[PDB]
Specification:
Largest sheet: 7 strands, mixed
Order of helices and strands: EHEEEEHHEHEHHEHEHHEEE
Pfam families: SAM_MT
Helix content: 25-40%
Oligomer: monomer
CATH class of the largest domain: Alpha Beta
Number of strands: 12
Structural class: alpha/beta
Shape: globular
Distance between the termini: 38 Å
EC number: 2.1.1.242
Keywords: Cytoplasm, Methyltransferase, rRNA processing, S-adenosyl-L-methionine, Transferase
GO molecular function: rRNA (guanine-N2-)-methyltransferase activity
Protein name: Ribosomal RNA small subunit methyltransferase J
CATH architecture of the largest domain: 3-Layer(aba) Sandwich
Radius of gyration: 18 Å
Number of domains: 2
Length: 247
């Protein structure tokens, strides 16, 4: 995958070169987007719009820490969709991690989560945030065990995953046009619709032993057109619930 790789560390240790090779990233000097390695973290920027700033994955502060403390935890719409209740904290596989926002909530509530991200540039951002998150004196401990990243095809590896997770969560990039903030304008400018999203449902329902949860924006059709009477509705979107495959 092509993108403008920029080093703002000054160390000269070759860290960016290693990270690029690890995720199969190719430097593209005149690419519209740029992946920058700062002393603080790895961020994505929209070169033609400096005023927008850069976006990065941070489990320690910012929006993720705010949502952790104020979002409600087990009371979140996504927490209820996966079936979280009482002492029930299922193992989850998030086949469309993206920025890891939902995945972080689930891990924060007490779920053992395994994230998968096929997009190399997004995966690079997650890995960097995971590195920083693991190094946190407060959450670094449980984070390292409840939130881990895996690089593989969510269509082929979604079957070889072991041990089988009780729940599989899906939230593929839906073909949108409707963002309002910078954290999305920059990102959306990079990541486009997941053309094979519909193909995720089947392998997901096979992997999960209890439930498959699909986040869907309002009015969006169910994934793969497979209807379901079970769903948790929220503001601006819903979570379609499907039965998994008992062991």
């Amino acid at each position: 995958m092509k993108i403008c790789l920029i080093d703002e560390t000054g160390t000269g240790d070759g860290a960016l070169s290693v990270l690029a090779a690890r995720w199969g990233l190719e430097h593209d000097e005149d690419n519209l987007m740029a992946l920058v390695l700062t002393p603080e973290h790895l961020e994505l920027r929209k070169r033609d719009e400096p005023k927008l700033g850069g976006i990065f994955v941070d489990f320690v502060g910012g929006a993720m820490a705010h949502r952790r403390k104020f979002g409600g935890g087990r009371g979140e719409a996504v927490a209820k969709a996966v079936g979280i209740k009482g002492d029930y904290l299922p193992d989850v596989v998030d086949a469309t991690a993206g920025l890891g926002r939902d995945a972080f909530v689930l891990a924060s509530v007490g779920c053992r989560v395994r994230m998968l991200e096929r997009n190399p540039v997004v995966a690079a951002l997650l890995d960097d945030g995971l590195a920083r998150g693991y190094a946190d004196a407060e959450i670094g401990g449980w984070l390292q065990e409840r939130l881990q990243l895996i690089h593989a095809s969510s269509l082929t590896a979604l079957t070889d995953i072991t041990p089988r997770p009780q729940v599989v969560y899906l939230d593929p990039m839906f073909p949108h046009k409707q963002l309002v903030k910078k954290e999305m304008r920059v990102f959306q400018s990079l990541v486009g619709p997941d053309l094979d999203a519909d193909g995720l449902l089947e392998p997901a329902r096979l992997l999960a032993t209890k439930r498959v949860v699909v986040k869907r924006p309002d009015y969006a059709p169910p994934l793969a057109n497979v209807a379901t009477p079970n769903a948790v509705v929220t503001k601006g979107h819903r979570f379609d619930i499907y039965a998994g495959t008992p062991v």
